[PDB]
Design a protein around this ligand. Sequence first.
Ligand code: MG
Ligand code: MG
Ligand code: MG
Ligand code: MG
Ligand code: MG
Ligand code: MG
Ligand code: MG
Ligand code: MG
Ligand code: MG
Ligand code: MG
Ligand code: MG
Ligand code: MG
Ligand code: MG
Ligand code: MG
Ligand code: MG
Ligand code: MG
Ligand code: MG
Ligand code: MG
Ligand code: MG
Ligand code: MG
Ligand code: MG
Ligand code: MG
Ligand code: MG
Ligand code: MG
Ligand code: MG
Ligand code: MG
Ligand code: MG
Ligand code: MG
Ligand code: MG
Ligand code: MG
Ligand code: NA
Ligand code: NA
Ligand code: NA
Ligand code: ZN
Lengths: 90, 71, 255
Amino acid sequence: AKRTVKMGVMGRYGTRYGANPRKRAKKLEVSQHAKHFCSFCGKFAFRRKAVGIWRCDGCSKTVAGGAYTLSTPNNSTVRSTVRRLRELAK
Amino acid sequence: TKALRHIDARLASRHEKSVSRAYGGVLSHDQVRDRVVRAFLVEEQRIVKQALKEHSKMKLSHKRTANKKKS
Amino acid sequence: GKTVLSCRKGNGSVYQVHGHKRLGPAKLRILDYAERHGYMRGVVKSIEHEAGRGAALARVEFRHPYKFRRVKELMVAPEGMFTGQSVFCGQKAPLAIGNVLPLGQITEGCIVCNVEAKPGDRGTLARASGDYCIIISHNHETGRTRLKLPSGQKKSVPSTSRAMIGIISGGGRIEKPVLKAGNSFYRFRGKRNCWPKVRGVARNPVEHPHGGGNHQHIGHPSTVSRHSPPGQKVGLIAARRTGRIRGGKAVKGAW
RNA sequence: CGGGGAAACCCAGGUGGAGGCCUGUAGCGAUGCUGACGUGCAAAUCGCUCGUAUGAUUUGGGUAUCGGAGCGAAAGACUCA
RNA sequence: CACGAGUUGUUCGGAAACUGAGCACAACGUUAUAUCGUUUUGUUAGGAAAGUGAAGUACUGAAAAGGGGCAACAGAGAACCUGGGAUUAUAUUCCAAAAAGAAAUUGCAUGUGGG
RNA sequence: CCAACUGCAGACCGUACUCAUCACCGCAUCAGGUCCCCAAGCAUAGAAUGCUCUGGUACAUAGAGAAAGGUAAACUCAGGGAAGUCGGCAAAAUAGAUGCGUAAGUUCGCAAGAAGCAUUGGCUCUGAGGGCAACACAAAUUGCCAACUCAGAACUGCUUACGGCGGGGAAUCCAACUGUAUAAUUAAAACAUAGGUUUGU
RNA sequence: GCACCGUCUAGGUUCCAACCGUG
RNA sequence: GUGGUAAUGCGCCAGGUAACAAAUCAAUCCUCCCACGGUGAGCUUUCUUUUCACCAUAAUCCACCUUGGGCCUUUUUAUCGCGUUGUUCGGAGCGGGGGCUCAAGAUUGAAAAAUGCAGCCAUUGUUGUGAGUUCUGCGCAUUAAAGCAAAAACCUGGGGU
Ligand SMILES: [Mg+2]
Ligand SMILES: [Mg+2]
Ligand SMILES: [Mg+2]
Ligand SMILES: [Mg+2]
Ligand SMILES: [Mg+2]
Ligand SMILES: [Mg+2]
Ligand SMILES: [Mg+2]
Ligand SMILES: [Mg+2]
Ligand SMILES: [Mg+2]
Ligand SMILES: [Mg+2]
Ligand SMILES: [Mg+2]
Ligand SMILES: [Mg+2]
Ligand SMILES: [Mg+2]
Ligand SMILES: [Mg+2]
Ligand SMILES: [Mg+2]
Ligand SMILES: [Mg+2]
Ligand SMILES: [Mg+2]
Ligand SMILES: [Mg+2]
Ligand SMILES: [Mg+2]
Ligand SMILES: [Mg+2]
Ligand SMILES: [Mg+2]
Ligand SMILES: [Mg+2]
Ligand SMILES: [Mg+2]
Ligand SMILES: [Mg+2]
Ligand SMILES: [Mg+2]
Ligand SMILES: [Mg+2]
Ligand SMILES: [Mg+2]
Ligand SMILES: [Mg+2]
Ligand SMILES: [Mg+2]
Ligand SMILES: [Mg+2]
Ligand code: NA
Ligand code: NA
Ligand code: NA
Ligand SMILES: [Zn+2]
């Protein structure tokens, strides 16, 4: 059975700290504890150790970035921009 | 390799802490294999490019410079 | 009266940095002959976290230019760096995330981090997590590059200054509410002795300008002059305006 | 893992053991009796009752900051009655 | 209160011999005044702080950036165990050749085998 | 040159006793204060609380003994039940476990042990919950053995009977919450807090 | 004005040589 | 220096040990209880094949079954199989057949009965089951905007001597 109607992980806080702060923190908490996709391996294997550090469960890879998710939206834009500018250079 | 403390490690025989293979007691067998393969393949790949470059420079030696000559 | 807390903190004493668990300072490598004329290739060996800092650090291994040995560097890592990656530093280096180039070789519109204001200072601008600079334009007659800083100000630097390509890792750190006093306690445990904070109106007149009275209030304007002596300069120091900001929000700092 | 649904998802039974969570020892404190004592056992103690008790927790040794100075989750608190 | 006695270690704790939060001799600077400041973010000082193996009987003279030292009897480190009919009182410290006995470990020398 | 065997040698300081209702600090052999290790049996959820073998102790000035009035980590009280008092202060009171059952409000987590109803002893029985040994499908059976919990039945009894262990409900004011805090008359509505905003750079 | 201090180079091109280039 | 297809067995520079957290589940030594047996003592009007005590084995060495990890080689797996109390593993090699290693136990001996204990120159001399215990193993996923000291000393290799 479901055990909760919409509190999820934040059920550990009981009735403390207010509804909107709890709802805002829950979104980042779920992402921080999820398994993310490793493009080197081809499987869902990246876990966060400390803020900004992501380690693969099977292969020995460690990656930097994000603090609550593996990749931030600004970084993808930066990647495409860098690749296109380098394509112009070469 | 065994797990030995300070005096026991000092007083044990050498092969208690190593194996006869290269890098024995430092690297595992898969790491050793990968190093051997990588060394051979990279050296060969470098040789090919050096040869190609030298062959091109020798190609433009008795070519138009020594073929379409002018003095 | 007695000494005010903001002045007391300048003696050092129990308010210095908690540094025992930190690794060394984070810097680029030294601007030597190899970097001025060719390039150097290093390998990323590990990605780690240190207490007090939001960004991740990278240990990078190079070969020594003059001796038979290995040299380990500790840098602030950009987003996307991974263990086993090759890193190129020097004059002729390709445009890729993590490489280090002179500013005069990076095309306009590119996003950079770890920028040195003066050549050879090994990186001083755009280092906090998630931050970066934008390259605006070059000037070949005077050899100077224009940059847009994280604060929104513009700065001109010599075109021989170096910068890493990318964005500092660990971004988005401040968007999660803290919710608990204990979380703040653990956050400042790794930095220094500055929390919790007692309001000045809650103190007594002997130790703060705002203290005293039969109600909790400041009985005088809290905007103070730039020329006030220490112990008098508390409140809103040399403020150009106060109150809620409406419309465009201006760039802070000096002109 | 069972049942329902065209789908999106919904209902139910277990497993697991989170929390500046609850009751309660040791520990750390000190609400009420305006109790005892008030030439005291004691220049602040005793009894019962009571707060907290996985945390912004308690504690040994070492080390660092003082006299118009130090230190203070701020009472003009504390710096060998 | 008086008189007379009692504490035994190659291995137990410390030191010899680690590094920590830290301290501050030298050096340099400052002060009418050193009884002041700096001195671990790899590290003193406008700063010439290295005294050695090896080769060839002490001698002699190539390499090795970043002076000397202190700070933990709960961190690191550390080769020994039981039996005793062995005290008035000490004992993993004492016990005598059947050492009640059985070990481990460091230095330097013999010889036996191998280099 | 390399074990291993053998011979000789193995320096320095500490070591008694104490660690506390008499060996330390508090003017004292002062009901105060003072870090670490070992930790038995039965009841029971148990480092709660009560009693006990090993080890320890009978030391804290005593004897005789119905005044009034006191102190208590001491009890009862017909009928009434807060009329007492500034004020239910103090005392009484509730109570473990198991089944059923549970309102307004709500940040959906709670409120909640909400409130409330019922059972519980002793004795003699019954059922359920296991282990390992001996292409063909009821070894779907033979033997041996442990450890305790839960459920159901008959008979039989109460003087309601150790310890230990929440009283409950309806509302107003203040502060969001856990926390801190006038050592020796003030623990709060004060301070802190997460959250919000402004300033310098 | 003329001497002298006054010199060597990877590469790119067209045997030398020359023009570029600048360690 | 030398064996095995292999995992791996035998005679200046670079890494490693020192060196580091939670819970869960198993836990060894040791403690407690029970069953069976031997020795001493207690009670006995009666009853009690009874009640109580004891039944011990240090370091250091020799030789070489169980559990839990990592791996090799052969047969090549798939919607599917393997496994935990528990939040998972597999063509980057699952399962089966044979092996190689590491950790922790066990079992032989030596030491060692010549000792210790208890009745009295003689007797005795113990083997099984539950429960509790943090060593240890579950290898290095506790909150975390918290991510968990350092060095001496020592070990192995790469190079040349
Ligand atoms: Mg500092
Ligand atoms: Mg005040
Ligand atoms: Mg004033
Ligand atoms: Mg106010
Ligand atoms: Mg609590
Ligand atoms: Mg409690
Ligand atoms: Mg006041
Ligand atoms: Mg005397
Ligand atoms: Mg230091
Ligand atoms: Mg020094
Ligand atoms: Mg020392
Ligand atoms: Mg020690
Ligand atoms: Mg010793
Ligand atoms: Mg004695
Ligand atoms: Mg003694
Ligand atoms: Mg004691
Ligand atoms: Mg006393
Ligand atoms: Mg005294
Ligand atoms: Mg007790
Ligand atoms: Mg009534
Ligand atoms: Mg009345
Ligand atoms: Mg009246
Ligand atoms: Mg009362
Ligand atoms: Mg009830
Ligand atoms: Mg409050
Ligand atoms: Mg409170
Ligand atoms: Mg007070
Ligand atoms: Mg009070
Ligand atoms: Mg307030
Ligand atoms: Mg554990
Ligand atoms: Na009183
Ligand atoms: Na008890
Ligand atoms: Na009455
Ligand atoms: Zn991966």
